[PDB]
Design a protein around this ligand. Structure first.
Ligand SMILES: CC(=O)N[C@@H]1[C@@H](O)[C@H](O)[C@@H](CO)NC[C@H]1O
Ligand SMILES: [Ca+2]
Length: 647
């Protein structure tokens, strides 16, 4: 399946071998980046004047003159032909030729090629990734991996802007990178060029910028330093700030000066981009002069970013029409998915969907803000590439499976299984959600409706949950041991263990429901208890970040089904056997409205608490904000909303 799907595709249900010998035409005058790819694919063969003709070039090259009318008249467009007599790889421009090559490579399999004719180009001008999340910035190696992934997928934009880079944001935005980080950026730029990606270096000065000449020159000197590293595209981000830096006329004048005295003055600068302080509708002020000032004063070649109706949202026709009317140009979309920097205990591995597929003309660019997990982000990023190139043919689910099979061909079913049940965000302040476990939600919701009322449940529904748990465990175990993409495995490992625990708890809970007799029920019940505790252990020892620490998985449908089924059978067992088995579903070592444990804090989900031991106390915070520092006092009980201790 060709990804992204071409704007036009004629297939002949015939195929042809790849020239064992051929004659390369236009190998000298064509884009070197595209001739390298071609020369890599024809490795093992050779050229004479004998042999099948392969013509490669840009409109205006001599090699593709026969085809000038076939070449779509679009930046990045290309004609691609394969038939018995010859192969054609002709781009409207140099990047086009290279994209023609990225398509040619997906056609080739086992030394064979279909008879095809393709006219292709992108519906959206700028397409790619903005590394612009909070949290650990992508490693150097991950970045190198991303840029080749972008090239295979016809993404032409990498916007470097990790919030937690101190040379990107305050206060060291004024300082050049040190030797090491600078030699790495240099490399990244070279890798970006070779894959036809625009490295866009962003800067995030707003929080402490002074509107004087000193800070202005400092920004340009920084831009100048990046230029010497090879950067040829630039942005300035005023997102997530307060104070003076939020002045729209000042920002506009600063962008216009960069434009006028830097971007329109170098020989070869490409994109100049800005992210507004008011970057989505909910954060706008309809009655304030901010967005209209930007649209009026910002020079017309400068891009303005937008994330939609909310901080996290999908792009609607009405939504983009709303912003466009104010900024007076087609918005450059910053799409906050699969970024999870606000639900960092979740992985977001579901399909990319929700964006209107008929509004390509109303956007200048489309970029995805990804997870801090670089390889786990490839699923969405591949889907975004597909959507942004050919929205009209955007196929959510197909593109997802395609992504997954590309990233992990050795274990693709296993990764689908995992991903299918790691897509929802859980409740969050942005109110943004995704579906999850849709395939089994039906049989789950009936099994649970039936159960809760002494109505027997459908046996096939019980079997389907069983089959699911089984498949999850096969997936988790195979994934852990997969060595084809180790970086990917390292990123997901904690979630893979928790995902396995989940499915085991599901099996044991199902066994409780069967529950042949008393002793057996009790064995299963204890096993469950222990599995819960293991889940808690993982949740307090992995991914301990300061914000949403820990590891949640299959949270939308599966865990709730397991938790509730457990509480129910436990109830029936107590009723019938007069027992007082505890029904609680999450392990909690402390006692008290469930308690939670976050890092070194113990809290009641918003009279007396008994901790599992004696600890030195740090402080208590309460809100009906009260705050008493405990000053290392040994504390085990707390009577009368969060307690912090030493841990
Ligand atoms: C334009 C934009 O989304 N900027 C930031 C971005 O860095 C975040 O990663 C995004 C997703 O949490 N939130 C909006 C805001 O905090
Ligand atoms: Ca040329």
């Amino acid at each position: 399946s060709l990804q992204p799907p071409p704007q036009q595709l004629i297939v002949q249900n015939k195929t042809i071998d790849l020239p064992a010998v051929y004659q390369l035409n236009g190998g000298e005058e064509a884009n070197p980046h595209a001739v390298k790819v071609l020369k890599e694919l024809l490795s093992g063969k050779q050229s004479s004047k004998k042999g099948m003709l392969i013509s490669i070039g840009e409109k205006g090259d001599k090699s593709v003159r026969k085809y000038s009318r076939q070449i779509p008249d679009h930046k990045e467009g290309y004609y691609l032909s394969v038939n018995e007599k010859e192969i054609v790889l002709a781009g409207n421009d140099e990047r086009g030729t290279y994209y023609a090559l990225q398509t040619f490579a997906q056609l080739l399999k086992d030394g064979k090629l279909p008879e095809v004719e393709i006219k292709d180009y992108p519906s959206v001008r700028y397409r790619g990734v903005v590394e612009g999340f909070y949290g650990t910035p992508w490693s150097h190696q991950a970045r190198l991996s991303q840029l080749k992934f972008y090239g295979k997928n016809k993404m032409n934009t990498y916007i470097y802007g990790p919030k937690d880079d101190p040379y990107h944001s305050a206060p060291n935005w004024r300082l050049p990178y040190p030797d090491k980080e600078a030699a790495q950026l240099q490399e990244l730029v070279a890798v970006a060029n070779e894959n036809e990606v625009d490295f866009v270096w962003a800067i995030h000065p707003g929080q402490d910028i002074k509107w004087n000449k000193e800070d202005r020159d400092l920004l340009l000197a920084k831009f100048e330093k990046m230029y010497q590293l090879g950067v040829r595209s630039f942005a300035v981000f005023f997102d997530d700030i307060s104070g003076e830096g939020t002045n729209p006329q000042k920002q506009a004048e600063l962008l216009n000066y960069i434009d006028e005295k830097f971007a329109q003055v170098k020989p070869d600068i490409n994109q100049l981009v800005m992210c507004p302080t008011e970057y989505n509708k909910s954060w706008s002020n309809p009655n304030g002069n901010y967005l209209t000032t930007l649209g009026d004063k910002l020079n017309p070649s400068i891009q303005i970013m937008w994330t939609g109706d909310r901080v996290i949202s999908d792009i609607t026709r009405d939504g983009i029409s709303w912003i466009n009317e104010r900024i007076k140009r087609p918005a450059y979309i910053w799409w906050n998915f699969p970024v999870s920097d606000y639900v960092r205990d979740h992985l977001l591995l579901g399909p990319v969907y929700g964006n209107d597929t008929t509004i390509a003309k109303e956007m200048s660019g489309f970029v995805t803000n990804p997870m801090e997990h670089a390889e786990s982000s490839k699923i969405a990023i591949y889907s975004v590439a597909s959507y942004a190139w050919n929205p009209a043919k955007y196929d959510t689910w197909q593109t997802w499976k395609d992504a997954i099979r590309t990233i992990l061909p050795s274990a693709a079913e296993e990764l689908e299984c995992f991903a299918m049940h790691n897509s929802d965000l859980g409740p969050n302040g942005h109110g943004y959600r995704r579906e999850e476990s849709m395939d089994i939600q039906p049989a789950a919701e009936r099994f649970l409706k039936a159960f809760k009322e002494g109505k027997n449940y459908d046996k096939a529904d019980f079997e389907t949950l069983q089959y699911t748990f089984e498949r999850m465990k096969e997936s988790a175990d195979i994934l852990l041991m997969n060595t084809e993409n180790k970086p990917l495995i390292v990123e997901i490992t904690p979630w893979v263990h928790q995902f396995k625990l989940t499915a085991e708890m599901g099996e044991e809970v199902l066994k409780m429901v069967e529950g042949r007799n008393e002793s057996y029920f009790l064995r299963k019940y204890n096993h469950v208890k222990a599995l819960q505790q293991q889940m808690f252990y993982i949740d307090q020892t992995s991914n301990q970040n300061p914000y949403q620490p820990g590891v949640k998985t299959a949270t939308r449908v599966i865990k709730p089904l397991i938790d509730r089924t457990f509480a129910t059978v436990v109830k029936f067992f107590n009723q019938k056997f007069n027992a007082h088995l505890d029904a609680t579903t999450d392990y909690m070592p402390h006692k008290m409205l469930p308690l939670q444990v976050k890092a070194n804090r113990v809290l009641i989900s918003p009279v007396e608490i008994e901790l599992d031991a004696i600890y030195p106390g740090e402080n208590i915070q309460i809100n009906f904000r009260l705050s008493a520092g405990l000053q290392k006092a040994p504390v085990k009980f707390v009577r009368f909303f969060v307690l912090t201790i030493e841990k």
